[PDB]
Amino acid sequence: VNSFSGYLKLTDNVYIKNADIVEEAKKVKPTVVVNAANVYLKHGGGVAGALNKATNNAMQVESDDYIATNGPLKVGGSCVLSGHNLAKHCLHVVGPNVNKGEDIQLLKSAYENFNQHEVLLAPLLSAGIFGADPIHSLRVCVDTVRTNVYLAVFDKNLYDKLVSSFL
Ligand SMILES: O=C(O)c1cnn(-c2ccccc2)c1
């Protein structure tokens, strides 16, 4: 048993809810919250801007130190950093940004990072301002992630479309 409430069960391991991932993290304080990161860990907008704002910019300060030491992530890659006031850990995952021309085949590699963690609270990778089709992102998630993933979908309209079109 875990603390996640109000989710619709899609598969053995994938759950979904219409929720603000920031508000959900603040309420649950999960072991792992996933950030929709870019390779520079520049948390300007979308999910990353919202998570970082909720940390009072502490996520960005930690991220800048990480990049100064390690250099940029790979598209499809990840790193584990603090979850600050939102979670124990933040798994920063870089899905391909379609609005920058990145190979959508890298979305499966991105979701494979989730398999290193038993339970996660996550957004749909490469959705929103990353430009991918969220229906596709949910299918790759279901077909790739084997650990228990709780998906927060901000937009109620999109949530309902994802549920009603799910195979
Ligand atoms: O609410 C969300 O989490 C979400 C993810 N993707 N999108 C979205 C919004 C507009 C156009 C494409 C995707 C919304």
State how far the Cα of 18 lies from the Cα of 48, in Å rounded to an integer. 18
Question: According to the 3-state scheme, what is the secondary structure of 33-94?
Answer: EEEEECCCCCCCCHHHHHHHHHCCCHHHHHHHHHHHHHCCCCCCCEEEEECCCCCCEEEEEE
Ligand 1 centroid – CA 127 distance (Å): 6
Q: At what angle do helices 46-54 and 58-70 cross, to 10 degrees?
A: 120
* 155 in contact with ligand 1, CB cutoff 6 A: yes
* 128 in contact with ligand 1, CB cutoff 6 A: yes
Q: Please, what's the largest Cα pairwise distance for the chain?
A: 45
Resolution (A): 1.0
DSSP state of 7: P
Determine the residue of 158, 159, 160, 162 to mutate for testing ligand 1's pocket, defined as the one with the most ligand atoms within 8 A of the Cβ atom: 158
Residue type, 100: K
* Interior angle at CA 76, CA 88 and CA 122, nearest 5: 35
State how far the Cα of 86 lies from the Cα of 37, in Å rounded to an integer. 16
